[PDB]
Enzyme design. Structure first.
Site, PDB file in Angstrom:
ATOM      1  N   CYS C  90      -8.903   3.605  11.516  1.00  0.00           N
ATOM      2  CA  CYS C  90      -7.430   4.176  11.615  1.00  0.00           C
ATOM      3  C   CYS C  90      -7.540   5.508  12.528  1.00  0.00           C
ATOM      4  O   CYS C  90      -6.581   6.037  12.669  1.00  0.00           O
ATOM      5  CB  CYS C  90      -7.031   4.582  10.342  1.00  0.00           C
ATOM      6  SG  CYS C  90      -8.210   4.434   8.800  1.00  0.00           S
ATOM      7  N   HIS C 357       2.153   3.702   8.511  1.00  0.00           N
ATOM      8  CA  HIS C 357       0.547   3.919   9.395  1.00  0.00           C
ATOM      9  C   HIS C 357       0.221   2.775   9.735  1.00  0.00           C
ATOM     10  O   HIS C 357      -0.696   1.711   9.298  1.00  0.00           O
ATOM     11  CB  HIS C 357      -0.244   4.287   7.948  1.00  0.00           C
ATOM     12  CG  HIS C 357      -1.855   4.475   8.563  1.00  0.00           C
ATOM     13  ND1 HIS C 357      -2.016   5.257   9.754  1.00  0.00           N
ATOM     14  CD2 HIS C 357      -2.992   3.964   7.992  1.00  0.00           C
ATOM     15  CE1 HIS C 357      -3.510   5.276   9.594  1.00  0.00           C
ATOM     16  NE2 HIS C 357      -4.051   4.406   8.816  1.00  0.00           N
ATOM     17  N   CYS C 387      -8.397  10.676   8.901  1.00  0.00           N
ATOM     18  CA  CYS C 387      -9.538  10.201   8.009  1.00  0.00           C
ATOM     19  C   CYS C 387      -9.741   8.908   8.484  1.00  0.00           C
ATOM     20  O   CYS C 387      -9.020   8.205   8.555  1.00  0.00           O
ATOM     21  CB  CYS C 387      -8.824  10.273   6.471  1.00  0.00           C
ATOM     22  SG  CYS C 387      -7.370   9.521   6.192  1.00  0.00           S
ATOM     23  N   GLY C 389     -12.265   5.194   7.933  1.00  0.00           N
ATOM     24  CA  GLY C 389     -13.090   4.392   7.002  1.00  0.00           C
ATOM     25  C   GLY C 389     -14.700   4.634   7.276  1.00  0.00           C
ATOM     26  O   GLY C 389     -14.958   5.047   8.284  1.00  0.00           O
TER      27      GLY C 389
HETATM   28  C1  LIG Z   1       0.997   2.258  -0.483  1.00  0.00           C
HETATM   29  C2  LIG Z   1       0.607   0.846  -1.126  1.00  0.00           C
HETATM   30  C3  LIG Z   1       0.807   1.225  -2.839  1.00  0.00           C
HETATM   31  C4  LIG Z   1       1.757  -0.368  -0.871  1.00  0.00           C
HETATM   32  O1  LIG Z   1       2.185  -0.799  -1.950  1.00  0.00           O
HETATM   33  P1  LIG Z   1       3.172  -1.940  -1.951  1.00  0.00           P
HETATM   34  O2  LIG Z   1       3.470  -2.589  -3.393  1.00  0.00           O
HETATM   35  O3  LIG Z   1       2.671  -3.033  -1.051  1.00  0.00           O
HETATM   36  O4  LIG Z   1       4.723  -1.318  -1.480  1.00  0.00           O
HETATM   37  P2  LIG Z   1       6.031  -1.123  -2.163  1.00  0.00           P
HETATM   38  O5  LIG Z   1       6.928  -0.106  -0.937  1.00  0.00           O
HETATM   39  O6  LIG Z   1       6.686  -2.366  -2.539  1.00  0.00           O
HETATM   40  O7  LIG Z   1       5.876  -0.177  -3.486  1.00  0.00           O
HETATM   41  C5  LIG Z   1       5.597  -0.727  -4.882  1.00  0.00           C
HETATM   42  C6  LIG Z   1       6.968  -0.022  -5.649  1.00  0.00           C
HETATM   43  O8  LIG Z   1       6.979   1.129  -5.249  1.00  0.00           O
HETATM   44  C7  LIG Z   1       8.156   1.536  -4.808  1.00  0.00           C
HETATM   45  N1  LIG Z   1       8.438   2.851  -4.327  1.00  0.00           N
HETATM   46  C8  LIG Z   1       7.325   3.037  -2.968  1.00  0.00           C
HETATM   47  N2  LIG Z   1       7.482   3.919  -2.370  1.00  0.00           N
HETATM   48  C9  LIG Z   1       8.664   4.743  -3.194  1.00  0.00           C
HETATM   49  C10 LIG Z   1       9.317   5.860  -2.694  1.00  0.00           C
HETATM   50  N3  LIG Z   1       8.841   6.770  -2.166  1.00  0.00           N
HETATM   51  N4  LIG Z   1      10.510   6.150  -3.825  1.00  0.00           N
HETATM   52  C11 LIG Z   1      10.736   5.221  -4.937  1.00  0.00           C
HETATM   53  N5  LIG Z   1      10.087   3.924  -5.013  1.00  0.00           N
HETATM   54  C12 LIG Z   1       9.236   3.778  -4.094  1.00  0.00           C
HETATM   55  C13 LIG Z   1       8.891   0.465  -4.137  1.00  0.00           C
HETATM   56  O9  LIG Z   1      10.345   0.313  -4.364  1.00  0.00           O
HETATM   57  C14 LIG Z   1       8.133  -0.696  -5.236  1.00  0.00           C
HETATM   58  O10 LIG Z   1       9.090  -1.071  -6.422  1.00  0.00           O
HETATM   59  P3  LIG Z   1       9.402  -2.376  -6.042  1.00  0.00           P
HETATM   60  O11 LIG Z   1       8.055  -3.219  -6.206  1.00  0.00           O
HETATM   61  O12 LIG Z   1      10.329  -2.971  -7.458  1.00  0.00           O
HETATM   62  O13 LIG Z   1      10.239  -2.782  -4.931  1.00  0.00           O
HETATM   63  C15 LIG Z   1      -0.716   0.480  -0.798  1.00  0.00           C
HETATM   64  O14 LIG Z   1      -0.893  -0.862  -0.925  1.00  0.00           O
HETATM   65  C16 LIG Z   1      -0.847   0.949   0.861  1.00  0.00           C
HETATM   66  O15 LIG Z   1      -0.461   0.500   1.555  1.00  0.00           O
HETATM   67  N6  LIG Z   1      -2.221   1.566   0.921  1.00  0.00           N
HETATM   68  C17 LIG Z   1      -2.422   2.283   2.185  1.00  0.00           C
HETATM   69  C18 LIG Z   1      -3.521   1.275   3.021  1.00  0.00           C
HETATM   70  C19 LIG Z   1      -4.220   2.210   3.820  1.00  0.00           C
HETATM   71  O16 LIG Z   1      -4.187   3.408   4.127  1.00  0.00           O
HETATM   72  N7  LIG Z   1      -5.404   1.438   4.667  1.00  0.00           N
HETATM   73  C20 LIG Z   1      -6.077   2.211   5.656  1.00  0.00           C
HETATM   74  C21 LIG Z   1      -7.617   1.512   5.545  1.00  0.00           C
HETATM   75  S1  LIG Z   1      -8.093   0.273   6.395  1.00  0.00           S
END
Ligand SMILES: CC(C)(COP(=O)(O)OP(=O)(O)OC[C@H]1O[C@@H](n2cnc3c(N)ncnc32)[C@H](O)[C@@H]1OP(=O)(O)O)[C@@H](O)C(=O)NCCC(=O)NCCS
Ligand SMILES: CC(C)(COP(=O)(O)OP(=O)(O)OC[C@H]1O[C@@H](n2cnc3c(N)ncnc32)[C@H](O)[C@@H]1OP(=O)(O)O)[C@@H](O)C(=O)NCCC(=O)NCCS
Lengths: 726, 401, 401
Positions: C90, C357, C387, C389
């Site tokens: 990243c 991101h 940051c 990996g």
């Molecule tokens: C962030 C992460 C948890 C994404 O999860 P996700 O389940 O795919 O994303 P969602 O937006 O659906 O989040 C799950 C729930 O949180 C809720 N939510 C997320 N952000 C919110 C916010 N700011 N306020 C309120 N609710 C929120 C969503 O509405 C969802 O509820 P739902 O399932 O009923 O719709 C995670 O998997 C991610 O993306 N990590 C980053 C990876 C990374 O940095 N990689 C780099 C290394 S290669």
């Protein structure tokens, strides 16, 4: 705001029986065919809203038609008026249409298409949105997505659904890239329709019978398309599969191989939309399909092809160039003179249309070989492509070859296709005038000799007409009708009916030098030979011809059209203008044709021309060309070579419009496409002027601007005529 | 400021079919080279190593996930050593060295480890996909043809016959055999071993030292079925309209071999060497990136070479050794005809036709080959160039110090 | 000699589920940005563009085959413009800019086009594989744990509670909404359109401007099932033996979003700008590559920042704006606690928690974000860090000119 809608009239009849099956009967009041117009979009939008509103009391849907056909067409008048600033309206319109089909496709209930007749374009797309398709096995009904022939693509889900049904390769090569039309028996074999019935009366009853059977034997999977199930596997894989991705790089290259580099954007857009759609979900693929459709409708090429292959062709079939007021006279027996390659086909296309024709030649052995040309074409149809049947025996029973001139007793239509010698034709017609019936028509397959002078050999000059066929007439669809000075209107009226009966499209021209088709071909071939004399690489000339859009390269055609016969046209046109008092200015290409004849290379007949010929097959270019004409010492841009061959024909057709050879611009466009091989993407040599698109701009203004640029660098023959406002 | 080469080693190249390196994961090939560099300088403070740049053309599967970073962590190197994978096709090996030299030259990096790795028997060509080949709109517009089609087109345009390219293929087998026979590769080819110290491969097994001129003439054009089925011949002749027909002259004997291998180069500044007791072997004089027609694809070396010569201020006469990767024989013959280079200067120790072509590692391999011949012959300057996919070109000029 | 930034633009970031950019192939995202740079300087002689460096973390499928070279050819750029894909996870976006600045600084390149592209809705994370994750011997030895496990471990070691990280997630949503509300992104965010000119996306649709502190507290730890099934919690506690239990504090609301996007930066020398009529916006002062423990993985920014400050000769007081990518909230809080950075200096326009991101493009996006805020606030210096990996770290210091 996105919904099923975008004061019309309703075109869909609603009926729900006691079992819960709704029968949507398409029946456009304004017209005899179901057409995808503003009325249909509103009608279907109301119909699908009612299906969602009554989903509790509905168990299945049957989509049928009240016309003789199922559904075929669309408001072409709106599509051709779509400017690039209307791309948003085009996108939303096609998105709304697919949204209605996608709703119908995901009702959780089986929907069956009852295809009674032709289902073309938007009609097949409606049927493809269904889960089960039943077609009536009746000839004359087609099934296809022929949007590519108008410079378009099947925007109503055709690309997306055929790919999900057949995979990228089969859907593109067979269904999409060429707009192939299938018979109901053929469509069943590939998988467009799912089952067949004998009569249209048993069509809708079988559609409801399948619904009850589907709900009983498969309740969980009823009303679900294969691509809507979990674990769906696209036939042949997706672009990420290692099997398909191994050959996927060859799909665009083979497309350029077929298109020969011609600037036709629709086949590229269809292939792009098909592959990009297979990488994403079905709903995202539909949107990608809509963006490529809007890209074509707003483009200039699609406006050219809609203008020619819809408007100009419809105006011709409506008897535009036919003289109005004359009724219809029949044809009892046709007589063909000369069993050569051209004449043999005329006996075939006449007999294929049900006309009993007598084929006469000098010797009986020549007449039998002419009939053998039709039998060779029938071996590839009766027991090869499965297009014919035991009826082809009656086709060959119509052709009765002979060598006696007395066998023309009772012949109403006389077509002759002998060598281009006026003294010869004056004698063969004088020996038949008193033999055939008095009111018979005297046709003459002639490409150069003027009809007016050719008609003097017979007494009834008012029945003498020029009926110019193209080779091979088994495949070429244009018939050039040439009016003599004494040709009666009733004469060419019967000929106009005949050419429509043999499945061809006619154009009417007045008698002049080279008529219209031969005259404009000469400017095409002479433009290439002039370049060769200038030192242009012969390989570049052939590439410039095929990349312009022509079917055959110009030098290859200069060998089919015998190079000696071109020289005889050169000496004939000089004597004609010199006998009129004028001074003859030779064309630069004549010094090239004289050198090839002097070198003993006249074309395919002698076995040596611009190409080399061994074992009856065309080998490569003659190696002695580069040293003979200093080829390579002149390297103009390839676009200049392409424009030279296109502008020369476009300027010459404009002269034919000025001189009065052609009466309508539709015959100029269609006559250039189906008789000259003018590139279909241009929409004809007359549409090429109004739809020109180059670096200078777009339209007639840029055409005369580019013409002056070509004339300022390549000779004053490219200066535009006065008929083009300057 | 100035960028110097302190070490340049490589593995032997194992062939594709029944190759010795097939059982070796490509991460093992790189760490084995790191282990060798650590055996030569055990007192080197590896914390001064700023980055590790590894070129890789198919970074998928065993080669995905920034394999350069995997090597840094698997080899027990300090965690501050970074690690980055790059892909400029078959010039990735030399692009890593050029980037390392440019990183050193910027002053923000002191000691960089450049190189490449490719395991074509494990990760085949085109495993990573690509829009140029798999996306129709991109393929149809750029007129994509495979590199082998451009090679035959080069020989067709330049008049190189089948005998002409087979004559160079024979020459490459001979000079590569003479190079191995004379021990020219004894100090720079690190044999691959397993975790038990048992030998796996110690020589370039793709070589056929007993090849005859008559044996090459019996081979068939391997790309005749690719051009006929794929239609790539017609696509190439639409761009090159003046050419009538393609002369298919390249076969298995006169084209580069599909092999596995890895290379590693240590580049640092003049201050970094004196602080570590390292003696500089050569100096990076200049690098250049250019290109030419992507349809013919393989003509990139010519302008890239002219650009690096102008930047360094030198002409062809100033360069003692020319090393061009032997992806296809016609590319070398074309590059020679353009710049009028004597045969005695061009690929003196054989090339990829005999020893193989590990895509991501080739650029660093043929660079380390030239730092040895410059030291062996006691010559001054050398020029390294590789033909790149998409019509790119990368050239580098090194000087023995 | 000196490296300057002339242009820095980016696309809006389309979210993962039902995203607007899902129908856009990642090659289209880059050429659309090239088209925008061509609209701003139509008289720029693109032949002086030496190279095009694009960072990409999953270079497979739509992103394989050196997508940087595909963009050069699909955008009608001159064939001499090169093109190369790199992957330093990243930080690939910022590594491309640093490499471009180092290429410019070496003098062997004049005008470079750096950036990145990632279509995570089309090319998911880890599509390229990798030895660190998929090779057991490499995984077992380096003690591989996902980045989310290291994030929760950071908050556990530093005492960051669930309320503490959700308080920053709220702050990121607010400042990102204020940045869009005030039009801070109006000149640098190029809306994505189709071939018909119809709009596809014009804003960062991952943002949730109406997020409440009580709404974040209702979210569940998204990485609780990953650590229990995978056993990565126990692996992390073997290296960090003094820690007893992992406090799982990161959720969907306080972690970076999975989005699509692309960015593009034009870096050139001072001579290249005056010859093209280009006005310099900022100057690359110094770059640095360092790292820290790969198990915790996300602590690389701290030593990378200290190294770039020492090379430039500046302290924390000299930097006006600190931009750290918000991969996880604890990373930003940890990086702040280490260097004692005021909140008013750190991610002033929000970050990846709110706007998303896109891995390969993020480094160039947050760099272009800082060249605008430096020009808007009329400040002098800014420091960009991400940051990485495997425990890597990359930091860059830019100065407004
Ligand atoms: C962030 C992460 C948890 C994404 O999860 P996700 O389940 O795919 O994303 P969602 O937006 O659906 O989040 C799950 C729930 O949180 C809720 N939510 C997320 N952000 C919110 C916010 N700011 N306020 C309120 N609710 C929120 C969503 O509405 C969802 O509820 P739902 O399932 O009923 O719709 C995670 O998997 C991610 O993306 N990590 C980053 C990876 C990374 O940095 N990689 C780099 C290394 S290669
Ligand atoms: C060289 C290439 C033809 C390999 O073909 P191959 O069939 O896999 O390789 P082989 O060695 O089996 O060659 C085929 C035949 O040629 C013979 N042959 C090859 N080189 C020979 C030589 N020098 N002398 C005698 N025979 C030889 C082989 O023995 C074999 O005969 P066999 O099939 O009976 O065993 C080609 O596919 C290739 O590798 N191209 C390079 C690709 C490239 O450069 N990529 C870069 C762009 S990303």
């Amino acid at each position: 705001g996105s919904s099923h809608h975008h004061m019309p009239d309703n075109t869909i009849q609603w009926d729900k029986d006691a079992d819960g099956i709704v029968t949507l009967t398409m029946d456009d009041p304004s017209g005899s065919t179901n057409v995808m117009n503003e009325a249909y979009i509103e009608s279907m939008g109301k119909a699908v809203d009612r299906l969602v509103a009554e989903k509790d009391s509905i168990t299945g849907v049957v989509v049928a038609s009240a016309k003789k056909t199922f559904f075929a067409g669309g408001d072409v008048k709106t599509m051709i008026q779509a400017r690039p600033e209307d791309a948003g309206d085009v996108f939303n319109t096609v998105e709304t249409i697919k949204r209605q089909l996608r709703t119908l496709e995901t009702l959780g209930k089986p929907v069956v298409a009852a295809i009674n007749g032709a289902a073309l374009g938007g009609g097949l797309e409606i049927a493809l949105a269904c889960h089960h398709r039943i077609a009536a096995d009746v000839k004359g009904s087609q099934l296809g997505l022929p949007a590519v022939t108008l410079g378009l693509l099947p925007g109503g889900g055709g690309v997306t659904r055929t790919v999900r049904m057949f995979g990228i390769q089969n859907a593109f090569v067979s269904v999409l890239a060429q707009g192939t039309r299938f018979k109901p028996a053929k469509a069943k074999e590939i998988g467009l329709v799912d089952e067949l019935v004998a009569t249209v009366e048993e069509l809708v009853p079988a559609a409801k019978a399948w619904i009850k059977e589907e709900l009983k034997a498969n309740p969980d999977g009823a009303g679900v398309q294969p691509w809507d199930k979990k674990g769906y596997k696209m036939p042949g894989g997706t672009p990420s599969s290692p099997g398909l991705a191994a050959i996927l790089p060859s799909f665009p290259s083979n497309l350029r191989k077929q298109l020969k580099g011609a600037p036709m954007p629709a086949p590229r857009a269809i292939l792009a939309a098909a592959v990009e759609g297979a990488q994403v979900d079905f709903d995202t693929a539909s949107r990608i399909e809509s963006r490529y459709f809007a890209s074509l409708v707003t483009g200039q090429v699609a406006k050219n092809m809609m203008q020619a292959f819809f408007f100009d062709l419809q105006a011709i079939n409506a008897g535009g160039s036919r003289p109005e007021g004359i009724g219809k006279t029949p044809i009892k027996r046709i007589g063909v003179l000369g069993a050569g390659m051209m004449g043999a086909g005329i006996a075939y296309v006449s007999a294929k249309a049900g006309y009993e024709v007598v084929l006469k030649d000098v010797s009986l052995e020549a007449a039998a070989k002419g009939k053998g040309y039709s039998e060779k074409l029938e071996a590839k149809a009766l027991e090869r492509g499965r297009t014919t049947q035991e009826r082809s025996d009656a086709l060959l029973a119509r052709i009765t070859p002979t060598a006696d001139a007395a066998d023309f007793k009772g012949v109403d239509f006389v077509i002759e296709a002998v060598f281009e010698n006026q003294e010869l034709k004056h004698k063969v017609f004088g020996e038949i005038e008193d033999i055939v019936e008095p009111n018979a028509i005297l046709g003459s397959n002639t490409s150069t000799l003027p009809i007016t002078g050719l008609a003097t050999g017979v007494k009834r000059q008012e029945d003498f007409i020029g009926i110019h066929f193209f080779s091979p007439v088994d495949k070429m669809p244009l018939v050039e009708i040439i009016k003599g000075e004494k040709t009666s209107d009733e004469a060419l009226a019967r000929v106009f009916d005949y050419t429509l009966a043999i499945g061809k499209t006619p154009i009417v021209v007045n008698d002049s030098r080279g008529f219209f088709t031969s005259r404009v071909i000469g400017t095409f071939v002479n433009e290439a030979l002039a370049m060769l004399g200038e030192g242009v690489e012969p390989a570049s000339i052939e590439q410039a011809g095929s990349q312009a859009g022509y079917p055959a390269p110009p030098l290859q055609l200069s060998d089919e059209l015998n190079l000696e016969l071109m020289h005889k046209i050169a000496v004939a046109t000089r004597k004609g203008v010199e006998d009129a008092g004028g001074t003859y200015q030779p064309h630069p290409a004549e010094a090239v044709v004289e050198k090839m004849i002097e070198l003993g290379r006249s074309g395919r007949l002698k076995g040596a021309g611009f190409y080399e010929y061994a074992d009856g097959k065309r080998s490569g270019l003659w190696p002695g060309l580069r040293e003979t004409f200093k080829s390579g010492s002149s390297q103009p841009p390839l676009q200049d070579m392409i424009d030279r061959m296109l502008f020369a024909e476009a300027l010459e057709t404009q002269k034919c419009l000025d001189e009065g050879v052609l009466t309508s611009t539709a015959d100029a466009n269609i006559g250039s496409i189906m008789g000259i091989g003018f590139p279909p993407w241009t929409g004809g040599s007359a549409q090429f002027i109004v739809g020109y698109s180059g670096p200078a701009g777009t339209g007639k203004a840029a055409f005369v601007a580019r013409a002056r640029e070509l004339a300022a660098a390549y000779g004053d023959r490219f200066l535009p005529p006065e008929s083009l406002l300057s | 400021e100035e960028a110097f080469i302190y070490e340049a080693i490589r593995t032997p190249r194992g062939k594709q079919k029944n190759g010795s390196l097939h059982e070796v994961k490509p991460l093992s090939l790189v760490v084995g080279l790191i282990d060798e560099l650590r055996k030569r300088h055990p007192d080197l403070d590896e914390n001064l190593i700023s980055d590790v740049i590894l070129g890789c053309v198919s970074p998928v599967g065993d080669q995905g996930g920034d394999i350069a970073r995997a090597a840094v962590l698997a080899s027990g190197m300090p965690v501050t050593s970074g690690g980055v994978q790059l892909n400029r096709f078959c010039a990735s090996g030399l692009e890593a060295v050029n980037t390392a030299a440019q990183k050193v030259r910027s002053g923000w990096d002191d000691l960089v480890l450049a190189g490449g790795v490719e395991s074509m028997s494990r990760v085949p060509m085109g495993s990573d996909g690509g829009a140029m080949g798999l996306d129709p709109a991109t393929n149809y517009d750029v007129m994509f043809v495979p590199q082998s089609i451009g090679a035959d087109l080069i020989a067709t345009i330049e008049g190189f016959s089948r005998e002409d390219v087979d004559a160079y293929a024979l020459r490459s087998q001979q000079k590569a055999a003479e190079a191995w026979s004379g021990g020219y590769f004894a100090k720079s080819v690190v044999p691959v071993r397993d975790q038990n110290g048992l030998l796996i491969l110690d020589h370039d097994e793709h070589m056929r030292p007993d090849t005859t001129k008559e044996g090459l003439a019996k081979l068939k054009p391997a790309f005749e079925g690719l051009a006929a089925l794929g239609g790539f011949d017609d696509v190439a002749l639409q761009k090159y309209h003046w050419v009538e027909k393609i002369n298919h002259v390249h076969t298995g004997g006169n084209s580069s071999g599909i092999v596995d291998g890895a290379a590693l180069v240590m580049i640092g500044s003049a201050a970094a060497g004196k602080l570590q007791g390292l003696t500089p072997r050569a100096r990076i004089v200049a690098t250049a990136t250019s290109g030419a027609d992507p349809v013919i694809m393989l003509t990139g070396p010519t302008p890239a070479t002219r650009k690096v010569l102008d930047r360094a201020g030198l002409t062809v006469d100033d360069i003692d050794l020319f090393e061009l990767n032997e992806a296809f024989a016609s590319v070398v013959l074309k590059f020679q005809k353009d710049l009028n280079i004597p045969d005695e200067k061009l690929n003196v120790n054989g090339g990829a036709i005999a020893m193989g072509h590990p895509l991501g590692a080739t650029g660093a391999m043929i660079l380390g080959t030239m730092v040895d011949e410059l030291e062996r012959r006691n010559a001054r300057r050398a020029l390294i160039t590789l033909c790149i996919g998409g019509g790119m070109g990368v050239a580098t000029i090194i000087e023995r110090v």
